[PDB]
Amino acid sequence: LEMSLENVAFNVVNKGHFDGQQGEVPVSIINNTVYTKVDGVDVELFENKTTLPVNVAFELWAKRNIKPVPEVKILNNLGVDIAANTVIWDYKRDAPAHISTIGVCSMTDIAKKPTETICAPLTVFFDGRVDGQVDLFRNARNGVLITEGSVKGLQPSVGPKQASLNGVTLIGEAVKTQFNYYKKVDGVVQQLPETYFTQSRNLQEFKPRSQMEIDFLELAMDEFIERYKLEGYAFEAIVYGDFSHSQLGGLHLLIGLAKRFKESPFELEDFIPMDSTVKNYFITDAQTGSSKCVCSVIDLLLDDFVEIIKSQDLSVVSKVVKVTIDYTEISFMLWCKDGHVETFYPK
Amino acid sequence: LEMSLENVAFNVVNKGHFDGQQGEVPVSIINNTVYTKVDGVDVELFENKTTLPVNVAFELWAKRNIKPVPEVKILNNLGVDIAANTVIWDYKRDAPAHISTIGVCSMTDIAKKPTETICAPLTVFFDGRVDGQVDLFRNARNGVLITEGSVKGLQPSVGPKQASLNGVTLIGEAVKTQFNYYKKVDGVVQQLPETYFTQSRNLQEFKPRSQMEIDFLELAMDEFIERYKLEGYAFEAIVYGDFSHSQLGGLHLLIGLAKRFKESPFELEDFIPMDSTVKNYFITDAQTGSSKCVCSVIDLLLDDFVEIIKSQDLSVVSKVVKVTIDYTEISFMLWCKDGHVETFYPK
Amino acid sequence: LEMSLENVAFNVVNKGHFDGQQGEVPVSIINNTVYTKVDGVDVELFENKTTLPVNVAFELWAKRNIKPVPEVKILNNLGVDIAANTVIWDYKRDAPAHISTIGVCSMTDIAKKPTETICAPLTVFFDGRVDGQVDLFRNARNGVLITEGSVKGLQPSVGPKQASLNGVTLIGEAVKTQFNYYKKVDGVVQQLPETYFTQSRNLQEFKPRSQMEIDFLELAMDEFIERYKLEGYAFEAIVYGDFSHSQLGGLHLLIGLAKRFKESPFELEDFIPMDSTVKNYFITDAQTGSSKCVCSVIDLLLDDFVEIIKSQDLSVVSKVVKVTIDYTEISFMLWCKDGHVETFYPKL
Amino acid sequence: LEMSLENVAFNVVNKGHFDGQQGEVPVSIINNTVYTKVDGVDVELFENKTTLPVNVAFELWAKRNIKPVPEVKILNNLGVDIAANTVIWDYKRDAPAHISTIGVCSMTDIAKKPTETICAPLTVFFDGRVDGQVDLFRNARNGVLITEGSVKGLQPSVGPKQASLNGVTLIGEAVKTQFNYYKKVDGVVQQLPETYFTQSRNLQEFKPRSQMEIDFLELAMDEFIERYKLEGYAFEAIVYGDFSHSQLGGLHLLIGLAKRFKESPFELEDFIPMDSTVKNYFITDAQTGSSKCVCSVIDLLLDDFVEIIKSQDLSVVSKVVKVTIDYTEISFMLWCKDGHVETFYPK
Amino acid sequence: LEMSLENVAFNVVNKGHFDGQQGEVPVSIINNTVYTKVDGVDVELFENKTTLPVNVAFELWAKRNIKPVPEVKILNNLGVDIAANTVIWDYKRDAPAHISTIGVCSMTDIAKKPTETICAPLTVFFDGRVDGQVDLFRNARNGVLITEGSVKGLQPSVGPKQASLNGVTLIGEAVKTQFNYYKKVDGVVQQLPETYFTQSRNLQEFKPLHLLIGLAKRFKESPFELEDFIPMDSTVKNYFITDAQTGSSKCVCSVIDLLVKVTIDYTEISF
RNA sequence: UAGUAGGUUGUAUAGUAGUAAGACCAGACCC
RNA sequence: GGGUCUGGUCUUACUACUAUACAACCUACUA
């Protein structure tokens, strides 16, 4: 089997997600909210924040993937258009990561199997922990495959350490959250270039993942620059920021935002609440009264950021640098003075 | 069995009402409308005009009674509070005639059988064309029973000739629309009083049902009164109406409204769109510019109204007359100008 | 008292409009509809088609004017911005004719009396059948006054014969629907221009109001033109209409639309459902398959239209003619050639 | 172009449809209705009855095709999935006939030209009155082409006489509403089979289109059979209908419905308000009280129906007959008594 | 009395709850929100999260009980179906704890007094701090009574130490939040058996994996997410716990906050 | 007199439209 | 080659709307 609204609500009530049990419960759809009657009183089960109909969005939310899955930004950068026999929920915007589905909900389904002709001109995300998906990826024309282990006859590409698990990114210890990515286009397997992976942290629950990051949060700016020999790279304004004018200077790394937040609180108004490698924020410092309309914040490991920034050479005043991050090219606007660097920020 | 939204929509699509078949179709609930996907495009199936949730109202509408059923005004006057194992749809206001149901929809059910203790202090409408309902009526404490035939041990009460059938009232020829009404209160059968029944007609599809009505519509105002000897009974004002002042005079019978509508069109704004024995209208005559804020219109057979007015014994100046219409008392405001009648209109 | 939602609903239930009685009834506001509980079941009382909140629109609808009132187009053309101590309901779009009110609903009120300073730079519609309104009009700076009779010290202006009464326009017989209009601007009484008044009819309930209209509805096109000496005025196109090409021809008078509708049914899609002197329609003829995207239809008495079309010389290649209709200037495009008119249509 | 909501509303206000002019007007989107401010008061321009967003549906409605276009049922039967550079509005359900568009609205566009790779595995409706569309049809892989005239190198297929024009079907006189249909699948032109075309009439504005229909609407049931020699074809029940039992007998042609409506009014509740060759109705006769839950009504010319019924032979008790109507197969359930056909109704 | 929407909004504006004052203020009902006009600009007063109409829910919210009241789980376990002359607001789901009311709001009222025949086959929650309610409980057929003190002729049952007060549970010091529970069924007083009472704490404001104390200890150690897929109030809570450090998650986790059939909160819990 | 300015009108360079007609180009049908 | 019908463009005459520049009239605030 039954694929109906009341069976989905029964599964949500008894297990929190659509498992596949048999049963039905009373359901009331008023406004965009789905209520259920428990002990004679209506209890809210789901509030629709999406653009889909109420029952369609509820069914997709209940059938979401609860296993560790790749972050939505990785899938978007890899060009994934649809997911095979699963729903990947984008918790950043509280909506499904993909408009259509394959064999999940009859209202949004374009097919019941990923091997149909309609699914051929689409990059389909194939899981690896579900049996039989590797064969479907081999027979698919366009598809992206993730695997905990290794696949015979293919060259694995190491992905990010962290992965999304019910909306909270983590480096799994009990469960393996590091996958191997395979991309197949037009029936030909394509290798993927080596890329630096964003750590996807947050200001509140910020924890350094390296010794250099620990020194950045604790040691002074001059001491940290002197110890690691970061002179002549404009590290004062690129990371720490300039809270002295009406507009901020630099501050394009999430680690600098975390350091400033620990020093003085401020507001990060995200005017595009989605998940992406590069985030734009409406930052307003509450102490110095300095605000910036657009602030491109990219969360990178500090050691790899140093390696990236020191592998471009100081020879021209201005240059555009293309860096492969999350399997996509990132355009960095680089300004260089003579002897030192002026400014290096993402576009 | 399955009791779900998609099975109900499948039954509506394939048969127009909930029959009890097995199947499911895609359903989208957006706004108060229930859409279904037919040939890849959404088709509207039901628009909620009720005060209930969208899916609850849709399920009640699909499970409505399609057999000839008594008019909602008769049930309200008899004091019916709930219907046993059926839904009676009030097409006048496009909502169920009763707030709760017995064994129909889990969201509105108060019980699964009419014999439970919760249903005891309620007048339950028991059908007669469904097997086993007569026994339930006998065992019920408060209930109203309708029967095409006769029931042993009970005195039948003849009901109205017409009955509702999918929202259009008719005097059935192929199907019997005349029932026998039995009312049982506190376990004791009560014999219903002798009463007149409203014909429940409309101005557009108005057809006379007696010789007197045909003469009323065909003959002039003076000719009709002279032929039937209605002098000194205010038939000109009460029935025909007086469109000569800023406010109307009389016009409290639907037959007079039909005659005027055939003569000159006008607007009847019903500010309480429900079904009742006495209707109040905001009548505005479009020819003479005469309007009346409240106009109590009661549809009665002309012969019965003549009998009622001739039995009034007009001797006192003012008197309140109680007339049993549709198993309920109707308060008629009677004014008599000593010698003849002054005005006789319902309150 | 009391000015509350439940008292308003009680008045609607017991009398159909807000009279001023004391009482309350259960009320449920869900969606844009206002329901009431009668005999244990919810009954719909009002569905909000306006741009106002549900209870605000319900209160304005209940307090609407039920007496014969001037049509909304006349008020808009006269420049009326607000109504004094009343609500004028625009039944064409099922919303109040004016955004704000004076002493009606606390949510929309800008004042409690029309004599306040905020109401001074506004043209206020003052009634005449309500006692004391004439004095307010005299003391007002900008205002429009209607009166069944005559007012001392002022020159009356005769208005249209018909007036709106609960959404249906009529030439009242029992009740006088013809008023005298007075307009006062900046404390100085202004006389209103002499004008022709639109009859405001409809295709379904269309009834001729003159001998010429009866002849038009009965006689053939050629016979009517011959009888009324309308030679060389494009009456075949301007009025009767030309359903011969892909686009329509002329057909800019409602009487011609009524004649065609009686001949062959068609659809008039009104893409701006409001009330105005000149109406634009998306007419699609169902017989010949001829449709026109924009069709300016103005309802005028056929004698008045004949006089208007005979009052303009036709030697110029083209000209824009301004005609005072419903106290406003209507622009007519006079595309003519060699004396005989080619077309004559308003704009909207 | 400018493609914005206010430009679309300006075009609607000044011309009734999106022509392509430059300008803007105030717009208010509250509920599903789009209002505009004219002379200081909001005027409703469009009420959304679709499943699309308010502004998307408004833009599609304004950019609809106002020229004579084929009826939506013909396009659905031909398998049209999308329309090239135009929007075909389905006035029966007040929604666009196709979910996606090509180069019309950026919210629903899948491409800007019909020659892109994404549009290749889709049957695209190509007009013929727009210059350059014939070349696109020739270069297209899957597409349907209509032409007023003839196309060199292709065999024309004569379509229906009538065509939709702003929601009202008509046999155009001033404008040609008869097209020639060409279907191309997988780059190979397919000839369409000879077929019968539904006249697509309605009960209210019903006008006979042949001598036989006039005789049917005037002559008696027995006289009409005698004159046209229809004995042993169950013409009494198939077309006229039988209002004698609880359920109707036959009445599967719209001409019979029109005749009955002229005789006695009744209600046709369409529980699937869409456009299709075969329509199912919830017919309830208001005179005899006879109702039928499902009534398959197909509007065919009486001469064509006679030709169909006289070419099936009377040899088996039950048989399924496939008839090509509107370029699609119609399944007719045929029951034959030994000697004469018993019941012949569409499924 | 006056019982109208504008009087209720006036009471909310001037006192925060329906006290019973006389007055009216402009009110706008758009969407499910009730706005009021203060200084010429609309100010939101109430957003409807319930299944009731906007004005009905607003009137019930304004007429809610602000005194210390028993927790909703205790009332549900005791079988309370309706409250006499008061509204008990369930702050966990932001909706009234009972579908119908007695003499509060005309849209939801089934009666004006708890002594009517319609209220007889219902367990009615009778207060004890309101004068005259004890007599109504004595005359009632089915009802539950709470009392700060003692009632003559009845055996008191000691209830939980904590009680709800404007949505925050507390062990009252200035005000007594410990009541004595009396249950009367079919006109016969039934004694309440001994039972253990849930402390009803929370992880954030916790002051001394199926016990809430273990959840609090883990939260102090490592943060995690508790997705409550049934946001209501009950003795036993099911959570969708996902540990953010070890990546360990459990779909259903029955968490009961305590200091085989077990008598907890006047009901039976099966382990 | 030296400056900063809101409404009305005119001139100049421009860009769209207008429910009539004529002309040019292109396509279809017929002779 | 001619006639009719459609898609695009120009002209006929008068007006409406948007953009910029300058001037005049009624006049507003300072030295």
CA-CA-CA-CA dihedral for A43, A48, A52, A58, to nearest 10:
-40
Taking contacts as CB-CB distances below 8 angstroms, the residues of chain B near A4 are 2, 4-7, 24
Q: Which of E15, E112, E161, E250 does the annotation list as catalytic?
A: E250
Tokens encoding D311: 């070419």
Cβ neighbours of residue D204 under 8 Å, at least 6 residues apart? none
Based on the number of CB atoms within 10 Å of its own CB, is C146 exposed (0-12), middle (13-18) or buried (19 or more)? buried
* Contact in structure between E84 and E123 (CB atoms under 8 Å): no
D32, D271, D289 member nearest B31 (Cβ) = D32
3-state secondary structure of C328: strand
- Alpha-helical regions (H) of D51-201: 54-62, 72-78, 133-139
**E17 counts as catalytic:** no
Q: Which of E15, E113, E210, E220 does the annotation list as catalytic?
A: E210
Q: Which CATH class is domain E5-63?
A: alpha beta
CA–CA gap between residue D255 and residue D272 (Å, rounded):
21
Q: How many C-alpha atoms does B334 have within 13 Å on its Cβ side?
A: 23
Residues in chain B: 347
| Resolution of the experimental model, in Å, one decimal | 3.2
Residues with CB under 7 A from strand G: C 245-247, 316-320, 331; D 23, 129-131, 174-176
**E210 counts as catalytic:** yes
Q: Do C173 and B287 count as a contact with CB atoms less than 8 A apart?
A: yes
Cβ neighbours of residue A253 under 8 Å, at least 6 residues apart? A238, A239, A297, A298, A299, A300, A302, A305
Annotated ligand binding at E254? The verdict is yes
Residues with CB under 7 A from strand F: C 237, 247-250, 252, 280, 292, 294-296, 318, 320, 333, 335, 337, 342-343, 345, 347; D 19, 21-22, 131, 148-150, 152
Beta-ladder partners of D183: D144, D190
Q: For B75, which DSSP code? A: H
Annotated ligand binding at E250? The verdict is yes
As ranges, strand F nucleotides with an atom below 7 A of a protein CB are 16-21, 26-29
Based on the number of CB atoms within 10 Å of its own CB, is E232 exposed (0-12), middle (13-18) or buried (19 or more)? buried
Chain mean position to CA B103:
24
B234, B314, C203 from B317: Cα distances, Å:
14, 8, 50
3-state secondary structure of D64: strand
3-state secondary structure of E2: coil
C35, C38, C170 member nearest B286 (Cβ) = C170
Question: Which runs of E-coded beta strand occur in B265-340?
Answer: 266-269, 279-285, 291-297, 318-325, 328-335
* Region for residue E187 given its phi and psi (left: phi exceeds 0; alpha: psi -120 to 50; beta: otherwise): left
Q: What is the distance in angstroms between the Cα of D256 and the nearest Cα belonging to chain B?
A: 20
Tokens encoding B213: 């009505």
Radius of gyration of chain C (CA): 23
From the CA of C320, how many Å to the C1' of F10? 22
Helix (H) or strand (E) run with residue C188 in it: strand C188-190
CA–CA gap between residue A295 and residue A250 (Å, rounded):
8
End-to-end alpha carbon distance in chain B: 50
Instruction: Pick the closest to residue D282 from A54, B19, E86 (CA basis).
Output: B19
* Contact in structure between D332 and D344 (CB atoms under 8 Å): yes
Q: Do C90 and D17 count as a contact with CB atoms less than 8 A apart?
A: no
CA–CA gap between residue D345 and residue C298 (Å, rounded):
51
End-to-end alpha carbon distance in chain E: 52
Which sign does the torsion angle of CA C25, C26, C30, C35 carry? negative
Annotated ligand binding at E119? The verdict is no
Chain B positions with Cβ closer than 8 Å to E: 51, 53, 117-118, 121
B244, B271, B286 member nearest C174 (Cβ) = B244
Based on the number of CB atoms within 10 Å of its own CB, is C263 exposed (0-12), middle (13-18) or buried (19 or more)? exposed
Phi, psi of C33 (to 5 degrees): -105, 145
Q: Do C56 and E28 count as a contact with CB atoms less than 8 A apart?
A: yes
End-to-end alpha carbon distance in chain A: 50
Q: Do C3 and E5 count as a contact with CB atoms less than 8 A apart?
A: no
Which sign does the torsion angle of CA C153, C155, C161, C167 carry? negative
Q: For B194, which DSSP code? A: P
Query: How wide is the angle at C-alpha A39 spanned by C-alphas A34 and A44, nearest 5°?
Result: 20
* Contact in structure between E259 and E199 (CB atoms under 8 Å): yes
Taking contacts as CB-CB distances below 8 angstroms, the residues of chain C near E26 are 106-107
Beta-ladder partners of C184: C143, C189
Q: Do A118 and D121 count as a contact with CB atoms less than 8 A apart?
A: yes
Q: CB count, 10 Å around CB of A340? A: 11
Determine the residue type at A320: V
Q: What is the distance in angstroms between the Cα of C30 and the nearest Cα belonging to chain B?
A: 7
CA–CA gap between residue C309 and residue B151 (Å, rounded):
80
E6, E37, E106 member nearest C5 (Cβ) = E6
3-state secondary structure of B206: coil
A20, A44, B304 from A23: Cα distances, Å:
9, 19, 57
Based on the number of CB atoms within 10 Å of its own CB, is A190 exposed (0-12), middle (13-18) or buried (19 or more)? exposed
Mutate to test the interface with C, among E2, E48, E55, E58 (most CBs of C within 10 A): E55
Domain limits of chain B? 1-66, 67-192, 193-347
* Chain B residue with minimum CA distance to E120: B121
Determine the residue type at B304: D
Kindly provide the b/e burial profile for residues B108-135, where b requires at least 16 CB atoms within 10 angstroms of the residue's own CB. Answer: beebeebbeeebeebbbbbbbeeeebbe
Instruction: Pick the closest to residue B276 from C13, E8, C149, D149 (CA basis).
Output: C13
CA–CA gap between residue D159 and residue D148 (Å, rounded):
10
Per the listing, tokens 């055996």 go with E155
CA–CA gap between residue E53 and residue E33 (Å, rounded):
10
* Contact in structure between E70 and E192 (CB atoms under 8 Å): no
Tokens encoding B269: 């704004």
Q: CB count, 10 Å around CB of A283? A: 21
Cβ neighbours of residue B188 under 8 Å, at least 6 residues apart? none
Closest nucleotide to D149: CA versus each C1': F28
Annotated ligand binding at E105? The verdict is no
3-state SS, one letter per residue, for A94-121: CEECCCCEECCCCCCEEECCCCCCCCCC
Q: Which CATH number fits domain E72-190: 2.130.10.10, 3.40.50.2000, 3.40.50.11580, 3.40.50.300?
A: 3.40.50.11580
Q: What is the distance in angstroms between the Cα of B51 and the nearest Cα belonging to chain D?
A: 18
Taking contacts as CB-CB distances below 8 angstroms, the residues of chain E near A15 are 251-252
Taking contacts as CB-CB distances below 8 angstroms, the residues of chain E near B51 are 53
Helix (H) or strand (E) run with residue A8 in it: helix A5-15
CA–CA gap between residue B195 and residue B326 (Å, rounded):
6
**Which chains touch A (3+ CB pairs under 8 A)?**
B, D, E
Q: What is the distance in angstroms between the Cα of B118 and the nearest Cα belonging to chain E?
A: 8
CA–CA gap between residue A159 and residue A145 (Å, rounded):
11
CA-CA-CA-CA dihedral for B227, B228, B231, B234, to nearest 10:
-120
Q: Do A117 and D118 count as a contact with CB atoms less than 8 A apart?
A: no
* Contact in structure between C141 and C117 (CB atoms under 8 Å): no
CA–CA gap between residue B95 and residue C37 (Å, rounded):
13
D13, D68, D167 member nearest C289 (Cβ) = D68
From the CA of C317, how many Å to the C1' of G14? 9
* Contact in structure between C291 and C247 (CB atoms under 8 Å): yes
As ranges, strand G nucleotides with an atom below 7 A of a protein CB are 5-7, 12-15, 17
Helix (H) or strand (E) run with residue B185 in it: strand B180-185
DSSP track, C3-17 = --HHHHHHHHHHHSS
CA–CA gap between residue B239 and residue B230 (Å, rounded):
12
Instruction: Pick the closest to residue B127 from B157, B76, B87, B73 (CA basis).
Output: B87
Instruction: Pick the closest to residue E90 from E202, E167, E145, E177 (CA basis).
Output: E167
Query: How wide is the angle at C-alpha C254 spanned by C-alphas C250 and C256, nearest 5°?
Result: 60
Q: Do A107 and B28 count as a contact with CB atoms less than 8 A apart?
A: yes
* Contact in structure between B8 and B58 (CB atoms under 8 Å): yes
3-state secondary structure of C123: coil
Q: CB count, 10 Å around CB of A270? A: 12
